């Protein structure tokens, strides 16, 4: 049975990936903005639907090796959709479709992350849970970077706020998803890995926001950026503390504290610089 379910998943994944590539090519070779808008929406629509079908099938896989394959299939499709959109949606004088691209990337990242956590929660092995954590973190980082890069290709500050909020959203949900899966670890080695994953993602989200906010004089974007930075730190720190409380070996708690203090410093320093602007 697992072989059949897994095969059906691989088939859907291959079909979906090909279709995304074709949609991007079909629009990449056009001079019509509308052709591109449709490809942006169709890639996101398709990838979303494909992920949902995979999740539905994946739920019938009790074995960890097979669930891991399903997770990979979701993650691979989601990142391909994001790259296709980033390239497809770039340029356009930065005036046309940037809003669609940001929303599409963030929405795909949310669907893919929640879907992975949904399947990942059924692993009983710390090694497999760790793989799921990595998959979530990688999707979160790719989505943040794609949004960040589109925002800094802009010729004018049009939509930077959307980029700021989208990054804060993705980081917050991804952190919570990591904490959620991580809450089922029992060994300090793994709890420590979850803590770093959170800390790093939080740091990346803070830096992307900081840099966008710090690119030009922008008092109302500064207000948003500062709250987003403090917000991310609050969520990241609380998640770390919840996990840290289950560590009984001491050395690892000291490391968790160092990590928390680093996050606090990053948030404070980034904020002070944005406040001075």
């Amino acid at each position: 049975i697992e072989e059949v379910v897994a095969e059906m998943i691989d088939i859907l994944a291959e079909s979906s990936k090909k279709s995304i590539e074709e949609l991007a090519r079909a629009a990449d070779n056009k001079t019509t903005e509308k052709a591109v808008a449709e490809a942006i929406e169709e890639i996101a629509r398709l990838a979303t639907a494909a992920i949902q079908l995979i999740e539905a099938l994946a739920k019938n896989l009790a074995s960890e090796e097979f669930m891991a394959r399903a997770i990979s299939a979701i993650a691979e499709l989601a990142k391909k959709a994001i790259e296709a959109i980033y390239r497809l949606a770039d340029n356009h004088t930065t005036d046309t479709f940037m809003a669609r691209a940001i929303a599409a990337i963030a929405n795909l990242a949310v669907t893919a992350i929640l879907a992975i956590a949904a399947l990942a929660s059924n692993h009983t092995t710390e090694e497999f849970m760790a793989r799921a954590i990595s998959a979530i973190a990688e999707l979160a980082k790719k989505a943040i970077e794609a949004i960040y890069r589109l925002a800094d290709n802009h010729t004018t500050d049009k939509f930077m706020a959307a980029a700021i909020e989208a990054i804060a959203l993705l980081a917050t949900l991804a952190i919570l998803a990591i904490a959620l899966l991580a809450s089922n670890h029992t060994t300090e080695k793994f709890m420590a890995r979850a803590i770093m994953a959170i800390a790093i993602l939080a740091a990346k989200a803070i830096e992307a926001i900081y840099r966008l906010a710090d690119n030009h004089t922008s008092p109302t974007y500064i207000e948003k950026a500062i709250e987003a930075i403090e917000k991310i730190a609050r969520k990241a720190i609380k998640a770390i503390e919840m996990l840290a409380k289950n560590i009984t070996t001491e050395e690892y708690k000291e490391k968790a504290k160092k990590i928390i203090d680093i996050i606090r410093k990053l948030a404070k320093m980034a904020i002070k610089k944005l406040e001075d602007n």
């Binding site: 830096e207 490391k255 160092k258 990590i259 680093i262």
Partner: protein
């Protein structure tokens, strides 16, 4: 004062990106005056820029023995160790750079990354 001219030629070439020239000129300036911490530092930087990390480490360390408060040298020493995969050392040096200068955002970020790679 040949030592000062050697220094000046080194600094001009360095500033212009002519690291090959800057290195030879700094070696002369230092041969004549081994206590020139600034020349040691810039000598190390020219190697760093060329990917010559082993040399950059040795020279940064000498500049620091002469001037322990050079936060930038501590930072770059940490960076060279980091680039070589020596995360334990990268952590130690990023922390020192931060004690001297808490505003170094890059050191904080690199510090956290080194902690991830560590063990």
């Amino acid at each position: 004062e040949e030592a000062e001219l050697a220094y000046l030629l080194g600094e001009l070439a360095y500033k212009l990106g002519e690291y090959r020239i800057a290195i030879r000129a700094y070696r002369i300036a230092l041969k004549r005056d081994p206590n020139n911490a600034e020349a040691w530092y810039n000598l190390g930087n020219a190697y760093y820029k060329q990917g010559d990390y082993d040399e950059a480490i040795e020279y940064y360390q000498k500049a620091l023995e002469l001037d322990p408060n050079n936060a930038e040298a501590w930072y770059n020493l940490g960076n060279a160790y980091y680039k070589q995969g020596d995360y334990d050392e990268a952590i130690e040096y990023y922390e020192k750079a931060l004690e001297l200068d808490p505003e170094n955002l890059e050191a904080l970020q690199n510090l956290l990354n080194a902690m991830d790679k560590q063990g």
